[PDB]
Design a protein around this nucleic acid. Sequence first.
DNA 1: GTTCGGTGTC
DNA 2: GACATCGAAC
Length: 393
Amino acid sequence: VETPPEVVDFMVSLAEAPRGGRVLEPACAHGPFLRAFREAHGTAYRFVGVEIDPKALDLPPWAEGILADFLLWEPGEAFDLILGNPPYGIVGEASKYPIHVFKAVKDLYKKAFSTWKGKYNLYGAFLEKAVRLLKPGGVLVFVVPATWLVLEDFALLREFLAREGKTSVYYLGEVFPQKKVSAVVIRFQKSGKGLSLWDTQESESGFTPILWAEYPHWEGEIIRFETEETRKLEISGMPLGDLFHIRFAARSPEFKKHPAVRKEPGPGLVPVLTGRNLKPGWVDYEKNHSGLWMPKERAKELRDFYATPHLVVAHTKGTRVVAAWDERAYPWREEFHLLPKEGVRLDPSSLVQWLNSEAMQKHVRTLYRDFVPHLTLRMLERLPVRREYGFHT
DNA sequence: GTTCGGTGTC
DNA sequence: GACATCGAAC
Ligand SMILES: NCCSC[C@H]1O[C@@H](n2cnc3c(N)ncnc32)[C@H](O)[C@@H]1O
């Protein structure tokens, strides 16, 4: 893993430390952030680097190198500045997840970190650990994925940061070559409060920050790139979550173990549908992408709503809204399934057209950009629907 | 019950 | 770039 020079230079320009102050790089390896800070600001600081792998630790004689797990590390004194590129990844089984430690080690992480939620992430834990090691008024500058701005797993982290000091977020995007990650820079100071959102422009000279919006009373709410247009559209109709009960499909293991499900086609058997069967405005009932077949009438045994024709919205097609009416009522292995609430009048074909419209695609791309490769529930439930498509009596 | 990807594979 | 994970995780 190597952070591009223009990304490092941009983060160092945001970094601050008092003279003689303690500067720390977690997961430092050879320590590119300590070197860049020293070149820019001088030698009159106490430079420290923390690294877990003895093969990776290679710091110059002017920096103190510590062989330790940063997440379970207990230093004597706190730090004035913390900067760097933390490792990213979910801790779990090797067949599914990239971070592999003993169960007892993961238990030590869960115990240490109050923001740990769901599967969580290594970079979330690094963020909380760094804030806890900061002096009052201390500065943190990290480069992390943009996923923590919107996702539920990071709700406690967002609430934590809003409570501990003031936050600036700088959107970079996919700035790491051969790494599938949309990145942001977080500047945190352990004093004051509020959130500042920034866009960036890339030139040959580096990255230039452009102020987008300020949220002085930010309490840990989902972070979005709002405009005059997005606000206008949102108050034009009811939120989609107010009109529909939104459920997700049964998961692959539920189908695989179910006695009615077959691994091969046959008489009376029908394909279990995935996201590859869902298109803007229609459903492909013929193609099988899951490798699973079952009787259509037996679908209600996994989820009761599989027996009722309903609205299906896509989950893994990037940040966009792809919808279709499932007229036939098939078994689904993926996607959102929207069941109208009591007293809700709807026009299925008109609502599908609105959800697939270019106005809606632009709406979600403005707010959520490419933070995640999904349309999430929290994005979906906030989508505006006017009386022409769905009415609540 | 549903969430998430230094994505996974074409 | 297309076109989406899919199952271990809680
Ligand atoms: N800063 C570069 C990307 S993060 C990758 C580096 O962080 C180190 N690393 C991974 N987990 C760590 C941990 N828990 N504590 C300290 N260093 C870690 C790895 O050895 C690797 O050199």
